[PDB]
Design an enzyme around this catalytic site. Structure first.
Site, mmCIF file in Angstrom:
data_model
loop_
_atom_site.group_PDB
_atom_site.id
_atom_site.type_symbol
_atom_site.label_atom_id
_atom_site.label_comp_id
_atom_site.label_asym_id
_atom_site.label_seq_id
_atom_site.Cartn_x
_atom_site.Cartn_y
_atom_site.Cartn_z
ATOM 1 N N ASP A 106 49.523 17.624 53.492
ATOM 2 C CA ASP A 106 49.569 18.269 52.149
ATOM 3 C C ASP A 106 48.975 17.302 51.105
ATOM 4 O OD1 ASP A 106 50.746 20.711 53.021
ATOM 5 O OD2 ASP A 106 52.567 20.475 51.765
ATOM 6 N N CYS B 214 38.078 25.685 53.554
ATOM 7 C CA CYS B 214 39.441 25.157 53.292
ATOM 8 C C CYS B 214 40.013 26.003 52.163
ATOM 9 C CB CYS B 214 39.386 23.647 53.073
ATOM 10 S SG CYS B 214 38.065 23.065 51.927
ATOM 11 N N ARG C 124 37.846 19.090 52.331
ATOM 12 C CA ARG C 124 37.934 19.019 53.810
ATOM 13 C C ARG C 124 36.655 19.603 54.449
ATOM 14 N NH1 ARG C 124 44.167 21.310 54.156
ATOM 15 N NH2 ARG C 124 44.976 19.895 52.513
ATOM 16 N N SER C 125 36.176 20.727 53.952
ATOM 17 C CA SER C 125 34.955 21.413 54.450
ATOM 18 C C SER C 125 33.759 20.456 54.385
ATOM 19 C CB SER C 125 34.686 22.694 53.665
ATOM 20 O OG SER C 125 35.677 23.718 53.912
ATOM 21 N N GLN D 109 35.926 15.526 47.640
ATOM 22 C CA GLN D 109 36.640 15.757 46.343
ATOM 23 C C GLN D 109 37.305 14.474 45.834
ATOM 24 O OE1 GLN D 109 38.896 19.522 47.542
ATOM 25 N NE2 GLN D 109 38.653 19.782 45.332
#
Ligand SMILES: CO[C@H]1CN(CCO)S(=O)(=O)c2ccccc21
Length: 284
Positions: free
Chosen positions: A181, A215, A221-222, A262
């Site tokens: 998370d 994602c 994440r992508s 990110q």
């Protein structure tokens, strides 16, 4: 400069935040005018994440051709990817229309439906064999065929039917279920194992349409997944593996979708994954 030495130099100097901001500053800025049209407001999950006009995927319909999705094309590596947001309640039909029209074999999902107690994407695939899903707006039927649950990921076989023509295709769903998370995984071992399972399936190969990767926003994440895959493929094809510059590959990918990677922690994790994965590519 061998990236493994560049890595230790950034780590000992603690300059990850500085490297990351340099990328943010040099990244491409292209127009996203279609994404910002008032008719498309409920097709975007996040106001600040939009596909560029020049690289957006178009739906094959005269009504409204818009979806929050981008085509990332790499010539040398010979790889293409579609990066998209997690589908919304009103875009699950558009999502499967895109998979159909682009001839994709695989969908790669890097998020859970609920994280941090909030919904991060719609429940867009069926959970039981005998309870299929019909998408009336796009005329598609989706059936769960089989499910293989492992410790770090799940693989599903899905059947997608174009109700207009009664053609069917097998789609493979690769679901990475253990990204934390907060932060990034401590070791890249389970993420690289997952990447190699997607590769082994044929889903990334040129006989199919581009893999669909998502994602929640389709950039973080992508971004890590396509950056690691492309860097390892370039280290395979070239005479001098050491020639591969992960920062330059990321900037090339940011010509096709904004915001890929990110955080400074996602950048460090991408370096770790490529360095550890290369110890297979180079003959082990
Ligand atoms: C120097 O940039 C080259 C090589 N790449 C980086 C690997 O060192 S690339 O494959 O990302 C790419 C992508 C589009 C245009 C040029 C390039």
């Amino acid at each position: 400069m061998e990236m493994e030495k560049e890595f230790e130099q950034i780590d000992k100097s603690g300059s990850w935040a500085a490297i990351y901001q340099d990328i943010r500053h040099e990244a491409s800025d292209f127009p996203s005018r279609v994404a910002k049209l008032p008719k498309n407001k409920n097709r975007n999950r996040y106001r600040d994440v939009s596909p560029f006009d020049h690289s957006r995927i178009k739906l094959h319909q005269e009504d409204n051709d818009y979806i929050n999705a981008s085509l990332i094309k790499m010539e040398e590596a010979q790889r293409s990817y579609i990066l998209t947001q997690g589908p919304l309640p009103n875009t699950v039909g558009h999502f499967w229309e895109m998979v159909w029209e682009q001839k994709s074999r695989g969908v790669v999902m890097l998020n859970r439906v609920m994280e941090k107690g909030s919904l991060k994407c719609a429940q867009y695939w069926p959970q039981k064999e005998e309870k299929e899903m019909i998408f009336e707006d796009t005329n598609l039927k989706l059936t769960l065929i089989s499910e293989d649950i492992k410790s770090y990921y799940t693989v599903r076989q899905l059947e997608l039917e174009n109700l207009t023509t009664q053609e069917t295709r097998e789609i493979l769903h690769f679901h990475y279920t253990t990204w934390p998370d907060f932060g990034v995984p401590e070791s890249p071992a389970s993420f690289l194992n997952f990447l190699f399972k997607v590769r082994e399936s044929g889903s990334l190969s040129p006989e199919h349409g581009p893999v669909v990767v998502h994602c929640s926003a389709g950039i973080g994440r992508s971004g890590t997944f396509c950056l690691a895959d492309t860097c390892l493929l370039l280290m395979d094809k070239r005479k001098d593996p050491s020639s591969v510059d992960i920062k330059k590959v990321l900037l090339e990918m940011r010509k096709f979708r904004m915001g890929l990677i990110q955080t400074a922690d996602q950048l460090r994790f991408s370096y770790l994954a490529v360095i550890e994965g290369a110890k297979f590519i180079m003959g082990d």
